[PDB]
Design an enzyme around this catalytic site. Sequence first.
Site, mmCIF file in Angstrom:
data_model
loop_
_atom_site.group_PDB
_atom_site.id
_atom_site.type_symbol
_atom_site.label_atom_id
_atom_site.label_comp_id
_atom_site.label_asym_id
_atom_site.label_seq_id
_atom_site.Cartn_x
_atom_site.Cartn_y
_atom_site.Cartn_z
ATOM 1 N N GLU A 11 0.743 -1.239 0.000
ATOM 2 C CA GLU A 11 0.000 0.000 0.000
ATOM 3 C C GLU A 11 0.784 1.307 0.000
ATOM 4 O O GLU A 11 0.213 2.336 -0.384
ATOM 5 C CB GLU A 11 -1.003 0.021 1.156
ATOM 6 C CG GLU A 11 -1.954 -1.170 1.120
ATOM 7 C CD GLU A 11 -3.024 -1.061 0.067
ATOM 8 O OE1 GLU A 11 -3.026 0.095 -0.562
ATOM 9 O OE2 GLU A 11 -3.830 -1.940 -0.123
ATOM 10 N N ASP A 20 -6.298 6.530 -5.266
ATOM 11 C CA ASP A 20 -5.805 5.179 -5.360
ATOM 12 C C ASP A 20 -5.769 4.671 -6.781
ATOM 13 O O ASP A 20 -5.976 5.442 -7.715
ATOM 14 C CB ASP A 20 -6.509 4.222 -4.401
ATOM 15 C CG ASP A 20 -7.908 3.804 -4.771
ATOM 16 O OD1 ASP A 20 -8.339 4.221 -5.942
ATOM 17 O OD2 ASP A 20 -8.553 3.085 -4.042
ATOM 18 N N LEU A 32 -9.045 3.919 2.494
ATOM 19 C CA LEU A 32 -9.991 4.518 1.564
ATOM 20 C C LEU A 32 -10.849 5.560 2.256
ATOM 21 O O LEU A 32 -11.372 5.307 3.338
ATOM 22 C CB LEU A 32 -10.929 3.461 0.985
ATOM 23 C CG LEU A 32 -12.034 4.124 0.176
ATOM 24 C CD1 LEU A 32 -11.470 4.756 -1.107
ATOM 25 C CD2 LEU A 32 -13.158 3.133 -0.148
ATOM 26 N N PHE A 104 -8.342 -6.717 2.839
ATOM 27 C CA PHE A 104 -8.044 -5.308 3.119
ATOM 28 C C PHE A 104 -8.270 -4.492 1.844
ATOM 29 O O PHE A 104 -8.802 -3.385 1.853
ATOM 30 C CB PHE A 104 -6.607 -5.123 3.674
ATOM 31 C CG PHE A 104 -6.173 -3.706 4.016
ATOM 32 C CD1 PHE A 104 -5.646 -2.851 3.047
ATOM 33 C CD2 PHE A 104 -6.177 -3.305 5.354
ATOM 34 C CE1 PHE A 104 -5.228 -1.566 3.401
ATOM 35 C CE2 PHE A 104 -5.659 -2.061 5.717
ATOM 36 C CZ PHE A 104 -5.189 -1.179 4.726
ATOM 37 N N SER A 117 -12.090 -20.068 -5.948
ATOM 38 C CA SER A 117 -10.745 -19.999 -5.401
ATOM 39 C C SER A 117 -10.759 -20.352 -3.927
ATOM 40 O O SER A 117 -9.796 -20.914 -3.399
ATOM 41 C CB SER A 117 -10.200 -18.603 -5.524
ATOM 42 O OG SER A 117 -10.437 -18.136 -6.842
ATOM 43 N N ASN A 132 -6.679 -20.089 -10.611
ATOM 44 C CA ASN A 132 -8.032 -19.522 -10.556
ATOM 45 C C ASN A 132 -8.041 -18.044 -10.091
ATOM 46 O O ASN A 132 -8.725 -17.191 -10.632
ATOM 47 C CB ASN A 132 -8.971 -20.387 -9.688
ATOM 48 C CG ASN A 132 -10.388 -19.873 -9.705
ATOM 49 O OD1 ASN A 132 -10.763 -19.005 -8.903
ATOM 50 N ND2 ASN A 132 -11.156 -20.363 -10.666
#
Length: 162
Positions: A11, A20, A32, A104, A117, A132
Amino acid sequence: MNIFEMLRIDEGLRLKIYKDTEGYYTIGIGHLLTKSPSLNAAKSELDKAIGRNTNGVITKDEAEKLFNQDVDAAVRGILRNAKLKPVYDSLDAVRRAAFINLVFQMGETGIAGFTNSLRMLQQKRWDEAAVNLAKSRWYNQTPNRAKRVITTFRTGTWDAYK
Ligand SMILES: [Cl-]
Ligand SMILES: [Cl-]
């Protein structure tokens, strides 16, 4: 290496409001702020999250504090989520950090359909799960971060991140 250091690499850290990868107003370590286009709506949410008039800028400590909150909420959401919890429970420590990263980034929500998945991970079919996971907007939009996460799932080691 641990979840904090891992997400801090993925990040980055920015002390001034920024946009972002999706164009959303963010600050700190991937926090965010809003999906609205208004920079004022963003400053307002920021002041509300910090408890002060920030004028769009925060300190490293304030960023780290939001970060600790967000990782805690990520984990807690997983544990509250009936689809997620059983996967999480089934995993080893490293892979657990990989799952946290994914949540996250994309919310309990959007990962909503790594349905196939998730079943693969629970079954411990690492190679198949990695294949996948790669067939996703996620992977195509942020390929380098996706690859690191995917490799962590495949291998169960922190190699992608040393
Ligand atoms: Cl907040
Ligand atoms: Cl990336």
